[PDB]
Symmetry: C3
Subunit: 308 residues, 3 copies
């Protein structure tokens, strides 16, 4: 089984443009080289050439709808094509709005996949509940079967088909959820482990519980959408929406080590790394290196060591 890195230098899912540099900063930290030292064969697609839409007025409150919807249609066609060739897609972001295209394309080939969304946010606001309009806080909304028809058709997303149900996803890290989002997860009954559940159970029992909940009936492809701001700002400071009291460095590596060991990882997203959001140069380095470490962990590297 081979790996396929797909760079997604996109930022129109939020205000700050530095995220577009996430793919390159991750590559400069030696990501591909290090991944080639693991047990997998690594292929590097390169970065996607995102087509900008000049005339892109806000859809009501939704901003850059057409630029975002197009950028994701491209990504979805590339992930599906790589998934079609039996390779594990590894998407390096921009903003988390790229998960729409990452998961959509993936679910075309493995419609039975489940989603492990690591984030301090649920990113499940719809065009009608969002208060900012930033589409990086709405991906989950465009992906859920149950939320289909709950908001008006957004320009640029006609190609989108909600093919993943609320029972196929688990959240880990939540600590900053909007009122509408909380209402949505409770009504639809989306499984989650906010920081409260992590403190209550411990990361160990948390992973055991998300696997039994998602892989209890039958084993299936796993799509991990890791938002760097899932970890505490002390570890991943270079992100546009840091929330205090998050997952630790250790807890993050635990999550990935466990997903690795399942043997089911099929798709992976490393989102929201913004190399221009460091208070100090070292804060950017600390963030990048942590993202690279989490990515490697997903593909073999264990803290107990490794050997051939």
């Amino acid at each position: 089984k081979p790996i396929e890195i797909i760079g997604a230098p996109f930022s129109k899912g939020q205000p700050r443009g530095g995220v577009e540099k996430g793919p390159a900063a991750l590559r400069k930290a030696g990501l591909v080289e290090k991944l080639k030292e693991t047990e997998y064969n690594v292929r590097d697609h390169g970065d996607l050439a995102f087509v900008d839409v000049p005339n892109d007025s806000p859809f009501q409150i939704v901003k850059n709808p057409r630029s975002v919807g197009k950028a994701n249609e491209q990504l979805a066609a590339v992930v599906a094509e790589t998934q079609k060739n039996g390779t594990i897609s590894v998407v390096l972001g921009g903003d988390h709005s790229m998960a729409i295209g990452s998961i959509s394309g993936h679910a075309r080939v493995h419609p039975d996949l489940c989603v492990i969304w690591v984030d301090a946010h649920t990113d499940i606001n719809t065009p009608l509940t969002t208060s900012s309009g930033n589409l990086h806080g709405q991906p989950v909304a465009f992906l859920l079967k149950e939320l289909k028809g709950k908001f008006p058709d957004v320009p640029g997303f006609s190609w989108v088909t909600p093919c993943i149900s609320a029972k196929d996803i688990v959240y880990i890290g939540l600590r900053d959820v909007d009122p509408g989002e909380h209402y949505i997860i409770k009504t639809l009954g989306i499984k989650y482990f906010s920081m409260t559940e992590v403190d209550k159970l411990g990361i160990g029992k948390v992973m055991e519980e998300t696997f039994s909940y998602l892989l209890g009936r039958k084993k299936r492809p796993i799509h991990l959408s890791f938002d760097v701001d899932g970890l505490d700002p002390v570890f991943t400071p270079a992100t546009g929406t840091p929330v205090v009291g998050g997952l630790s460095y250790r807890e993050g590596l635990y999550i990935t080590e466990e997903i690795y060991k399942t043997g089911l990882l099929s798709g992976l997203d490393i989102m929201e790394v913004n190399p221009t959001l460091g208070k100090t140069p070292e804060e950017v380095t600390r963030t990048v290196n942590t993202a690279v470490a989490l990515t490697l962990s997903c593909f073999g590297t264990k803290r107990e060591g490794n050997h051939k």
Copy 2:
């Protein structure tokens, strides 16, 4: 059920006077506004006008006995009056010596209440075991039935009646206990979870265990006396007696979230916040904001989110 904020700008329980500014710094951080956004109706009594006692020589080694004993007699009459009107008292301190008056008044209306004392210290030295004389490290001593008559009558505290027994309180966070205090808790058999027990069990099992121990027989009013230095100096640096290896931000919010969910919180203290003890302006901001967050957590705010 309504909430009642009672400011207690008192500092004569220890050396440093900045604590008297704790109530105002907490209000400046938007405490009342934020509390009014929760599901409770919030009333703000204001700050107590503490009568200073000019001639207040040390009782043996005890300092400012009369000023402290008077200040607490006032507070006790106000908390009892608010408790008498079916409202939840929320006392913002100074030093922890104000817990004597906070709990005493509370126990007049709910003599069946239990106490969850979150602190890095036991604050159970008596006038005869204390080595500093600072009454903020002796409140528990003036409140316990079993410790009545174990030390001579201190001027200013004649109004005090030890109405809470050693079996009604649980400690969480302990990591700096004096020899006499350790002897006292072991002889009286006061339940506690020092940092050792938190590391052993995990905060989750710790709360489950203090609730079963205190609310096992019958459910009763809970009085939470939270000492800001209960959390690690990394979170609550602006306190006069910080000890390393304390509760985390996450663990602190867990404690309050769980007390909230019990539906039994009857009285609350937010003590030892000293807005003049910050190494840097941000350390003061970090401390205040954490105290405000813990207070809000006690009244509804959950990390998983909320909605109407």
Copy 3:
């Protein structure tokens, strides 16, 4: 039962010479005074006078073989002599290469002892697997019965006899293990709790599990070899080989508190403290004080308090 502090100002087990100052920095922090306040009688042997070997060319890749092998032969004779007099040896290092002599001498008197190696590294590279040649990352190699004859005879270590088997040791803290080391621990089946197992189980269950594994059949002398870089660089920054995502201050004290409570501690090492590796003066102070605290914890001091 008495305690015996044996200073081991040695650094030839690695590049940086500051470690030779570890014993003195620890004494300057008031170690002996504080240890004399515990329930034990404390004896201070002083620092060993290490004989330097002028002509000491690398054995193949192994550096300072003869200087290290001699320094440890001395230490082994002193620890065995103190162990012979029924006292608990407390060796203050330099580099971890001194554990060879510390444990060897100890095992002469208590050949039934088990080893609790707290470190971010396994220090089990042999003269043929090591890539650096630094003997502080090879002690365990010269001590294991199963690894006898697996590498050529190193000058300076003829006196060495591997008397401890792979089933008598448990590792805690691992997060930076070499390929050969990982192969060695898995083939020999050495018990370990890397950071992954600590996150999975919690430090509490981790200690319960190492005690049942090592003291299940019969109770026996415990030799704790604590490498300061076992804790996160945030607590013990002044070490030559810091790895991120390590044990916390709390977790470290937990380990020692539990070993204390077993009543079986027979030998103890406080290694890799380098008072010249502080980014700032406070980082050195933070490291020393943490090492002193861990040492005291091993001899009585509990976070819940103490009394006579």
